[PDB]
Amino acid sequence: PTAFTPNGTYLQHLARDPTSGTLYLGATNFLFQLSPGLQLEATVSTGPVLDSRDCLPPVMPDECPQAQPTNNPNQLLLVSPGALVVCGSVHQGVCEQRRLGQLEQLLLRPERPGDTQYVAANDPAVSTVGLVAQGLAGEPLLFVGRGYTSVGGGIPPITTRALWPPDPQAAFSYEETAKLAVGRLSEYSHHFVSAFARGASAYFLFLRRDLQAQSRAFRAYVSRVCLRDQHYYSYVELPLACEGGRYGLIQAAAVATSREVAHGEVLFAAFSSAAPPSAAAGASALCAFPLDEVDRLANRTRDACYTREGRAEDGTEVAYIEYDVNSDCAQLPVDTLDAYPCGSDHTPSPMASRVPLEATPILEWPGIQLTAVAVTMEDGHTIAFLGDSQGQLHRVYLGPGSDGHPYSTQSIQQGSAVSRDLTFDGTFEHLYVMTQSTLLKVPVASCAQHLDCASCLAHRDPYCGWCVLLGRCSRRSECEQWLWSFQPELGC
Amino acid sequence: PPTAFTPNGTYLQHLARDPTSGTLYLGATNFLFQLSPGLQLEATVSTGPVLDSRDCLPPVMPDECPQAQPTNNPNQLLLVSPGALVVCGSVHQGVCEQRRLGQLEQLLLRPERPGDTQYVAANDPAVSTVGLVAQGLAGEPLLFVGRGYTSGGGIPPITTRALWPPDPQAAFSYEETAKLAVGRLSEYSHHFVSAFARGASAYFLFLRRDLQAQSRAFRAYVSRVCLRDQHYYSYVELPLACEGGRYGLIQAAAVATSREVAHGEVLFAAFSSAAPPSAAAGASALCAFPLDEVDRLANRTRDACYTREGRAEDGTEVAYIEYDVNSDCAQLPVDTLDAYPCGSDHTPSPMASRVPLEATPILEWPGIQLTAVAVTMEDGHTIAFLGDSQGQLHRVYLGPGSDGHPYSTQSIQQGSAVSRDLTFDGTFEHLYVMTQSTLLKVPVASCAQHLDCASCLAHRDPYCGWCVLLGRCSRRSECEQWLWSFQPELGC
Ligand SMILES: *[C@@H]1O[C@H](CO)[C@@H](O)[C@H](O)[C@H]1NC(C)=O
Ligand SMILES: *[C@@H]1O[C@H](CO)[C@@H](O)[C@H](O)[C@H]1NC(C)=O
């Protein structure tokens, strides 16, 4: 397969322009721009740089003597409509903007940024996530979820930051209210896995300590805010549960449309089991949460807390206000739900559900730590692409007939985890896979190398069958008119 | 096996369940807990240790309380009212506070400097405190409180107390007349067992020393008072007799509507025999007093004392004034009963019957000290769950067919008494059972773990039987043809 293996660096993040298909790659001291065929369109160096976590940028040796040279693994890498957003691990995680298609060309780098323009975690271990969307002021906003770091200030775990503000020197700053107001950051230890949009709703997947549970164990959550408000009124926090927390550490996730799973888009999540913040080598599972059910529970958490003091019509306590913020649920008129579906400066917030969103595992893999999810539907049925901590990429048919073991496994790079940033190309014919030292372009389905029916059906791959009338080892859509290679009792 | 809650380094005093939400509030040593209907911890509040002497008045500051010690705070009173949770501790003269139903952490009202008229619960952890939430004439929240004697002082045994006066800082106080005026509190030695309401009436269950008897012995009594009446004019005590005082000491009770026992509500009360103060380790009985017969005798006791100087038509003192109070039965015109059925500032008070309200044991178990009662009617016939002093929960069928021995018994916690806060859930599907160190959620029936008819019928449980259609071990409702597992002569 086609590869990109830059020497002298490690790969942190992969961002694909959905309009152009250009790939941008965020590595240690390098950004890359790649053709959709992994041809190198451009290269930008970003480090090492003189830095100390105690000094504030711009880091000069005069007012930062403790400075030492410091490598710069990539923290945020995002395709905004206007530009490419790049945030690093160095200089308190400040960000810059580069020309989409001309990585080499820098659009904007605040010259002397403030305590409010430190964006990413300035620790490459800690993890930063991000989403871009159009704001009500006309210009595009950048949501950022941010793990905890022990330096500078205490940055909020989620923030909504301006990318194209009036003064461009203020870009990446957030209005005083554009944040989740969370104290005790060190205690919650937010660990972000992913952020995504759909409809008017932004979603964040993350881990955080349950401070009311007896163990103060970590616990997986999905929270939803409205895409458009700079503010965090609509913020609703749901706990996630894959088999009621046997697999309690969400590792990666992907959205996809599948019809036999549920109507609407569906969130496929990979949870591991804990040994304390990380997985144990321990088992993994893949759960699916239909977003229309994510919205329905989140919707009825809002509806309870706005109009029924946090109770269902059943009478049950379902909703409350998390993070010890001074705010309780209310008995506002039901007209409120229509007038202000995303809240006001005076509605309850931040809202959380007492009811967990629960899913029974689609598959349960005993020895594996899943790190990466990619899901598509082919000729009616789900096929998952799953990467693990050991650099393997598993392909799993999930339709009828399957005990859900990988029909195919493949070693991208032994002993090095596959990235959540695992993404398909535009036609869905290929999947870009990335470990820490290589990025591969992998074909979903290599059917047509087979030039005889018996070779076709021996490939044994849900994508492949023998089109009888055309003498072709093809995919069903490309047609005894198609002899599926994934039905062993059958043959030529 | 049950779902449980076992908090470390604490003991459980009371459990109060919210009849609308089903959420459970626990009251413990230095702790409040809030738990889902499934016993998941939703919140925890510390209530101690505190600085305190029984000699000081709250708020205890060291500049006014030199003798203050670290003092633990076992819970004394835990009641869901309409707006808040009422909480009263054993410290700070037993003062009370209120907290948000559904967010216990959030507090609603805690008088800043309270008076001699606002020391509510017994400021000694070994003394009884019972309470009942009612509404006054103007439909505002009231709190009847019964408390045992405690060696500042003079707190009346029963008092009506305002949960939300005009002036929030006046909460939990009581108007000068809103009290049962007892002189010799040390001698009467009220031990309150329970308070409950039904109809227009509030009822209290307690022990007191009978000082008109030669024995001066402790005797079990039930007293009734009109809910509207906040001045205790209408107060009237009936002695309770379970096999003529063989079983002297009432221990726990629970009301239930049962078809085969009487019309209306019926009080199922567990009495124990006195040790030749408290129970011997002895024998217990379960006696049933229909509330309609309580009201009848209390009504005849009122009538006989208003209009016939306490005598019946044949001429016998059947009613008299108790508690060496200066008041006598009168020969008031008969129309006084219609004009003043709950008494006056000028009518006889407080009233007692000379005639005991009598009942004969539903069951008598020698060698068991019963401590907790819950009764339900299942398919027309009474079932009683009874806890005891050794943390054992006995299940008893009382329909036709039994010598009244338990068809099932479990250890909740060996040798630690089951609390009289034994209480069903909302579907009467489960039972919340608590000893001093654990809380359990017990299903009433474990029918369906049964696969074959043999096994089903071998459970020998009045709840379980074999639905012959459907082919599963169900309950008579979830069928209609059904083979009862509590009829041994019947097989399949
Ligand atoms: C959630 O609520 C929004 C607005 O209040 C509505 O547009 C949407 O249909 C709801 N989604 C559900 C009920 O799944
Ligand atoms: C007791 O008396 C009241 C009024 O005096 C009456 O309404 C009630 O029904 C009576 N209860 C009885 C007789 O059981």
Author numbering:
A (entry chain A): 25 to 174, 177 to 301, 308 to 313, 317 to 514, 521 to 533
B (entry chain B): 24 to 174, 178 to 302, 309 to 313, 317 to 514, 521 to 533
What text does the study give?
To further understand the mechanism of the VHHs inhibition of Sema4D binding to Plexin-B1, the structure of human Plexin-B1 (20–535) was solved by X-ray crystallography to a resolution of 2.69 Å, with the asymmetric unit containing two copies of hPlexin-B1. Several cadmium ions were found in the crystal structure, some of which support the crystal packing observed. Initial Cα RMSD comparisons of the two chains found in the apo human Plexin-B1 structure revealed that the PSI domain (480–535) undergoes significant loop movements within the crystal form, as do several loops in the sema domain. Contrary to what has been reported for Plexin-A2 (18), our analysis revealed significant loop movements in Plexin-B1 induced by Sema4D binding, which extend beyond the binding interface of Sema4D. The largest movements seen are up to 15.2 Å in the position of the A5-B5 loop. In the apo structure, this loop is folded over and interacts with the cleft between blades 5 and 6 of the sema domain. This region in the structure is the site to which the allosteric inhibitory peptide PB1m6 peptide binds to which was previously thought to be a preformed cleft in the sema domain. Regions of increased RMSD also identify that conformational changes are seen in several loops on both faces of the sema domain, such as the A3-B3 loop, the B3-C3 loop, B4-C4 loop, C4-D4 loop, B5-C5 loop, and the C6-D6 loop. The C6-D6 loop is adjacent to the cleft formed by the motion of the A5-B5 loop in the Sema4D bound structure and is further retracted from this region in the apo structure, presumably to allow space for the insertion of the A5-B5 loop in the apo structure reported here. The work presented here questions this paradigm by showing that the sema domain of Plexin-B1 undergoes significant structural rearrangement upon semaphorin binding.
